Design a protein around this nucleic acid. Structure first.
Lengths: 129, 129
DNA sequence: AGACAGGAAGCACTTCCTGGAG
DNA sequence: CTCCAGGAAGTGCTTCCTGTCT
């Protein structure tokens, strides 16, 4: 059995650069970035899936903001501003706020027809219940 | 003498990403993009310094646009549009258009005191004139 | 107080287009 | 024609602020 296919490795399952390159959507966007962090085993301490579908929660809001800023060269980035970005998604039907729960948002389920992966397949690949 | 791990190889003398990080100017901008290609030995075939100060020339506009498009994930990018972005630099005083010379522009923001380099030195680190 | 909704203004283009000069 | 100038509209935030709830 020479032809070995040991899947991927230890890198974000859905990296932002590739997603954005694939869709030719322009420079990387906030939701694409959060998607990368979420499909990456290591990032799991400051951002994770709540287990309920596409609902995710920013366990440590500032760590996520710090990286968002470091990624776009916006040193003064933080959650108060990062979140304004999310609120604009409410109309564009991309992400919605999970009312009543601190730091909790949910992608619209149509992300599944774009990614090709099911929230459950993604949960499995990583490790969440 | 092992401490001879001191190179000056084939990587841009001024990467756009690092320049942006150094200034914390946000996503890579077009003028930073062209700066990187101009300070990269391997790109002297489609874009290069004309030898007069910071005057540069797009010897192959389409290749520059293509590359520009690939950096920001905008596959439909062409010179027609890249040059529109350049024109918006006139009122911002970042670039001046050499009149009577196809595809020739000049950086006019004070690049020397921001990069620390000199038109001459950069000309030296490269083989231009 | 911090989380959160959304108005307002600004930034750096990207995309479309009229129009003028060589 | 192609280059080139610049108007006008739109995107995806970034930055700032009022106001509400909790």
């Amino acid at each position: 059995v020479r032809d070995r296919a040991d899947l991927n490795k230890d890198k974000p399952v859905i990296p932002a650069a590739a997603l954005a390159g694939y869709t030719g959507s322009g420079p990387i966007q906030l939701w694409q970035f959060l998607l990368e962090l979420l499909t990456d085993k290591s990032s799991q301490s400051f951002i994770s899936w709540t287990g309920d579908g596409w609902e995710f929660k920013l366990s440590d809001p500032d760590e996520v903001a710090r990286r968002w800023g470091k990624r776009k060269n916006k040193p003064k980035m933080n959650y108060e501003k990062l979140s304004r970005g999310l609120r604009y998604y409410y109309d564009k039907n991309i992400i919605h706020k999970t009312a009543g729960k601190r730091y909790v948002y949910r992608f619209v389920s149509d992300l599944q027809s774009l990614l090709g992966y099911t929230p459950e397949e993604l949960h499995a690949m990583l490790d969440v219940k």
